């Protein structure tokens, strides 16, 4: 909704967010008590990697190695305060806010591989109960890619 200057800065900020998310490893599924619980947790993991994945790409296709710049410039702790700033009102206590205390260490800054992305999508089809919204989105996200979805 906002202007262009805010868009780029915000998309820059968002690119970092999606990146942080994608980096997060697949959760330890074996560690759950039951079959239903663990399958659920994994399902969400696939959803995270898939959604963030396509976003990371669509934002990185704008420019050449656009992702590298995002990390090299905002991975700095200065970005953490610029993120808290744009998202929240600074008046709230910045101590008990998880966003301000997270240890952003060694962002992979590696664009996602299509083959990995496919198995993330396929595993997350049941993430949103297969709403035609979900699939029509994925199908469109793959509409710009050189590899087609299964």
């Amino acid at each position: 909704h906002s202007s262009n200057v805010q868009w780029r800065a915000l998309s820059e900020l968002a690119a970092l967010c999606y990146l942080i998310a994608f980096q997060v490893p697949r959760p330890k599924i074996k560690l759950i008590k039951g079959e239903a619980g663990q399958n659920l947790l994994e399902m969400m993991a696939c959803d995270r990697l898939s959604q963030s994945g396509h976003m990371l790409l669509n934002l990185s296709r704008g420019k050449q190695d656009f992702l590298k710049e995002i990390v090299e410039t905002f991975a700095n702790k200065s970005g953490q305060s610029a993120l808290y700033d744009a998202l929240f009102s600074s008046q709230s206590p910045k101590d008990t806010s998880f966003l301000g205390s997270d240890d952003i260490g060694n962002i992979d800054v590696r664009e996602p591989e299509l083959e990995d992305l496919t198995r993330y999508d396929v595993g997350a089809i049941r993430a949103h109960n297969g709403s035609l919204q979900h699939l029509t989105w994925l199908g469109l996200q793959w509409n710009s890619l050189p590899a087609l979805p299964g």
Binding site: A9, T73, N76, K77, S78, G79, S81, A82, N106, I107
Partner: protein, 324 residues
């Protein structure tokens, strides 16, 4: 003379058991003393400082803790018997007690950290100052590397530059150049909080800023930040000590006090430019640490679209508007 500083060093020994007798050797001191302020009072300063040097020359840690307590009941057995004068700080050598305190908390901060890489940089740092007795007794030693530990910092830096010449940078070699950054840092964090409970040193810090700048050129993202929050932790202790020395000196001989300003001001500019590539999320804290250095935080607000930051800067400021 030596007969005097060996007579108060004998009255402090009794100043742990009782006082009456020691208070009469301080009373014999005030009547038998010289009492000409300008140097005879800096002849009993050169005595209280020659016994603080010997309580620092003194189970190597529990034995260096017993010595920060000893130099603490020696600073209490001076406040009472008084001991309310003398000061021969001059150049290179009361601030001298605090300083020898601060460096005994530094000696316990690198005693608490003992691993094979620092113990090697220390043995290289002591074999360079002189030879060691090889009758076992190989720390290779500390009780004299305390009265002078300032030197095992400028040498455990020359052993990170020869361990960086072989580093071949390659990832495990940029993890060994940060492990040392983290110790010289929290050894400077230990001298700061020992002052709250109240040109070689500096060169070795501007040397590891530049080597912490060459490495983030090739480094996994997160790591390049932790050594940046570190070189920001360290630069904020140097700029704090040049601020405290400024405030210490004022008025007449001002020419020397406005030439040392230009020197710290050409460095908060050389620490700013250095942080111009780095994250500006730390700029806000570097700008607040040397709480003006506005020219740097004012050009960080200009490079971005934060007309909100340059409004937040002028919102909390004393005449920044006439400055911006």
């Amino acid at each position: 003379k030596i007969k005097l500083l060996k007579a108060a060093f004998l009255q402090y020994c009794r100043k742990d058991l009782g006082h009456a007798q020691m208070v009469v050797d301080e009373l014999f001191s005030s009547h038998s003393d010289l009492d000409s302020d300008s140097e005879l009072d800096r002849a009993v300063t050169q005595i209280s400082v020659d016994l603080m040097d010997d309580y620092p020359a003194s189970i190597i840690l529990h034995q260096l803790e017993d010595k920060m307590k000893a130099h603490s009941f020696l600073m209490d057995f001076i406040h009472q018997v008084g001991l309310f004068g003398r000061l021969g700080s001059f150049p290179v050598r009361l601030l001298l007690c605090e300083h020898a305190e601060k460096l005994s908390a530094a000696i316990v901060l690198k005693n608490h950290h003992s691993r094979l890489s620092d113990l090697v940089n220390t043995a290289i740092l002591i074999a360079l100052n002189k030879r060691e007795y090889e009758i076992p007794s190989n720390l290779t030693p500390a009780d004299v590397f305390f009265r002078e530990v300032s030197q095992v910092d400028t040498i455990c830096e020359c052993l990170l530059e020869h361990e960086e010449q072989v580093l071949r940078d390659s990832i495990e070699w940029a993890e060994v150049v940060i492990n040392v950054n983290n110790i010289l840092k929290d050894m400077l964090q230990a001298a700061s909080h020992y002052r709250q409970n109240r040109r070689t040193v500096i060169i070795r810090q501007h040397e590891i800023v530049l080597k912490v700048a060459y490495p983030q050129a090739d480094s996994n993202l997160r790591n390049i930040v932790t050594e940046q929050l570190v070189a920001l932790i360290d630069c904020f202790l140097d700029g704090y000590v040049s601020q405290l020395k400024s405030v210490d000196k004022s008025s007449n001989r001002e020419r020397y006090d406005n030439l040392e300003m230009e020197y710290l001001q050409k460095r908060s500019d050389l620490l700013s430019p250095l942080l111009s590539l780095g994250q500006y999320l730390w700029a806000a804290s570097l700008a607040e640490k040397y709480c003006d250095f506005d020219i740097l935080v004012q050009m960080c607000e200009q490079t971005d679209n934060q007309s909100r930051l340059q409004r937040y800067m002028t919102q909390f400021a004393d005449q920044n508007f006439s400055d911006f």
